[PDB]
C-alpha cells in the first residue's frame, strides 16, 4: 500500500460488491484474494508520471502498489468471488455462504 | 453530486498529455474542450452507492459532475487536441503551436 484506491462496498441479501476504481491497472495485474475472511485486492498501478517526472506539471494521480483489504463478514463466500473491471472500475462480486 | 477526478499534466515533446483519472465513465462521454488557452475536461459519473447506500459497509469513490480546468501555456495547440480512455484513464494528447 503507497496508494490507497477508493473502494465502495456494499452488503446485498445475499452478495457483497466491492467496486474498486483502479484506473491505468490492467484487470489482469489486479488481484482479488480472500484470505480467511480477508478480502484483499493488491496491485501495482505504474503512472506515466515515473517515466520522464521533470516534466509534469501537475501531478494529483497517485499510484504505485496498491493493497486494499477488508475483513468481510463470514457469509462471504470466498469460493464464489468473482472480480470483473470495466472502464477502470473493478468490481467484485462475492455471495453469501 | 460532484467530484473532482485526478488529472496528471505532462509537457512532452511534441505535446501537452493530461492524464485524467476517470474510472467508470465511457471515454465518449468526456466533454474535453479548450477554449481560451484553458483544457477543460467535464463529464458526469454515476455511482452504484448512490442506490441502496445503506447497504453499503464503506464508501471511499467520488462521483457526480465532473468540470476541470487547467490553464495551459499559451503554446498548446486548441485545433490538435486527442482524447483516448484506457482502463478508466483519460489521455488527452495536446499539440504546440509548434512554437506559437
Known amino acids: 500500500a503507497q496508494w490507497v484506491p477508493r473502494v465502495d462496498i456494499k452488503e446485498e441479501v445475499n452478495h457483497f460488491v466491492l467496486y474498486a476504481d483502479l484506473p491505468g491497472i490492467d484487470p489482469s495485474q489486479i488481484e482479488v484474494q480472500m484470505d480467511k475472511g480477508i478480502l484483499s485486492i493488491r496491485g501495482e ?41 470495466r472502464n477502470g472500475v473493478l468490481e467484485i462480486r462475492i455471495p453469501k455462504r
Open 45 to 85: 498501478r505504474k503512472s506515466e508520471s515515473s517515466t520522464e517526472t521533470e516534466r509534469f506539471s501537475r501531478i494529483e494521480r497517485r499510484y504505485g502498489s496498491f493493497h486494499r483489504r477488508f475483513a468481510l463478514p463470514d457469509s462471504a463466500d470466498a469460493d464464489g468471488i468473482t472480480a470483473a473491471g
